[PDB]
Subunit: 230 residues, 4 copies
């Protein structure tokens, strides 16, 4: 009994095996550091409106996926307080542009775990039973236990949201896709530091018959989402 979501470039998931037990929502880096005033992204001068746009659409998707018993996953980009997991190059680039990782700012130490700006925003806050991944990189798989958690939960399908589209969401999508996870990007549930770059990251997914998976949007997903009993 297969179920499909209207998507581009093909009906998602590819084989219609869409159930709450094999499908997860992943909300990527909806932190004050990426979309709040005083955080990492605001420091570099980027338009916070572009990364706040996805907040309400992700909320509708989260509420619907929570209600139908789907697996829910959240990620935070961040570093250990002693910065032992912070590559030297990553730190130096952040310092040069005036937004140094580990440096004090209005929301505390930029991109440091346990600091106010680093935490997930209240509107999209995790509840009990939802796995949070704390990652030192852009991709959620690198140096984390995400893949191990996904295997133990026997998850085959991943629906990606969050920020930024072209950096954190996209790297995570490519990692999942390479390892065989079947992925759906929701275009209205993500935003980037450059709007052209946001749209191009979406288009990259559609090439070669869906090279990294397929693309849809929050309304199309929620109107066709299956529950536990069919």
């Amino acid at each position: 009994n297969r179920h499909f979501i209207d998507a581009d470039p093909y009906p998602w998931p590819y084989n219609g095996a869409l159930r709450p037990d094999n499908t997860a929502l992943i909300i990527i880096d909806m932190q004050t550091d990426f979309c709040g005033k005083g955080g990492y992204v605001d420091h570099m001068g980027y338009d916070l409106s572009l990364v706040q746009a996805p907040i309400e659409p992700i909320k509708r998707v989260l509420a619907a996926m929570r209600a139908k018993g789907y697996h829910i996953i959240h990620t935070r980009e961040g570093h250990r307080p002693d910065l032992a997991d912070l590559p030297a190059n990553k730190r130096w680039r952040s310092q040069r542009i005036g937004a140094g990782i580990g440096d004090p700012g209005p929301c505390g130490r930029i991109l440091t775990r346990g600091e106010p700006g680093w935490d997930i925003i209240p509107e999209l806050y995790p509840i009990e039973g939802e796995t949070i991944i704390d990652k030192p990189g852009k991709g959620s798989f690198c140096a984390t236990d995400l893949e191990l958690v996904l295997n133990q939960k026997r998850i085959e399908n991943i629906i990606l949201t969050g920020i930024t589209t072209d950096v954190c969401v996209s790297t995570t999508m490519r990692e999942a896709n390479d390892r065989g996870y079947e992925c759906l990007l929701l275009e209205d549930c993500c935003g980037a530091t450059d709007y052209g770059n946001h749209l191009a990251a979406i288009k990259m997914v559609k090439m070669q018959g869906g090279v990294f998976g397929s693309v849809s949007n929050s309304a199309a997903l929620v109107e066709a989402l299956p529950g536990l009993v069919p």
Copy 2:
């Protein structure tokens, strides 16, 4: 002691530690399947001139990097002949599009190791002592020994070339960057299935003070390349 390459958005590498012993050139997927007549990409109708453009610029970079004793790395996307490393979704999408992985075409079985179309093109062919990575995914790190080879060679700096810009080159850049490798993308030594997508993948690198490293071009690299002796 330090050496820099003129790059955008900062002089590369970040700390000027640029030597033949800690720096590698990586040539990504310069295979007939990605830029030849009769292969995977030609099958899907994409403009072969966009992916052939980088051939001569890569050749000039390779000749200069070979001459100064730099580490040279090549990659081929491909699958085991029995297709045991081919995720079901990857295969199905390629079939829908009319360019099925493992299916017979003019250059043999599409994207299958040991087939004519799968091999690296003659102009950029590896010589003895240059490591070739055979990868089942878009990123060169996933399910390969690339990282292990890089650590044994004590390589810190990576200069990326090849195709496609927004798929194979970009995923590999994000993997390397996340693990702390300091990377340089040469914009004239890569090309993609959509030219807009090629330029946007280049621009994505430059954001946030060089989120995935820095960008330059073949001439700027070759004119400022150090040898072992100052």
Copy 3:
């Protein structure tokens, strides 16, 4: 519809979900370099009879598992001909004890891929459709595509054989076990360079209620193996 194999310290697999589609036999490093005259192990002076002992038991297990449609996996420890994947410490230790990796011997370059001594012995030779893993380390997961192949084949159960019990078989078991694979070591289908060490690697598995899985033997497995429904 559960099936169990009589094993120590518990009936294997834990949950009785034992089928040809989710279970693989893994034959580890049955190469001339580990059990042949003139190879790596014979060079270090070890008793070849200890590592030849498992040949007939593995043959019976392989024939039965091949006949009932089970997944079959083989591994070879070895290095790229240019030795780019050979850590400096590994090489140096092999040279000190007179069995240098890459060095010429009676069966060719020790532990080098493509050389006679490196290949799997004739008695246990792979047939088409059986995945061979070429690994640069002791564990079959490190820097390989084993895990990726396992996931695409939806394999949950692994039955380990080969040499050496305490080095290559054991490392591979611990990697699989950590990632959640349910493993069975067949005690008569493995052997080591020290017989005490072989018996202790078997005992290590049984501790803490089966810390790495369970232990059984070739006869117990073959008489209780489930086949397909015709």
Copy 4:
């Protein structure tokens, strides 16, 4: 040249004598109440706690000396997320069958669960600021963790292993590090196991084939030959 060696078996460690505070780390593996304390995981399965407490004083001497000479210090804890999302079904089931269920309530709290009293590192070997702690869901410290990433960023080449248990957590971690090219030293008096025979055999496995996983030495030999920083 400016090389330093530690007297070890079967060869002087490290192999190439490149032994400095900046490229060498001490790793203390799973010295948690759950592995060596009263009321924890290991005590639940009936094992002799004296075998796993033996290494406490030797590790203390090695830690004090390595802390004093500016060496990198690493600690690990085996454990699981409170919702048990990182706990394989087989691992859980085996722990339940032998009466020491992971996540189940006991005297020191939920067995092998992060944030619980029994799960934490014992007081005698407690981490100080600037020492990386790895929280791992498996026996090997590399699997599903950021250990390797931290090691690379710190440009660490040499690892000196201590902790428990010798044949399970220490040994798996050694094999992972060794495979990826790290040069490793096991200190035999700074580790202990649930079976003493198994502890001695895990030590012997290291020495085979000219040091298949590295070399073996002991706390006294290490501390008297440890190079310091140049003031």
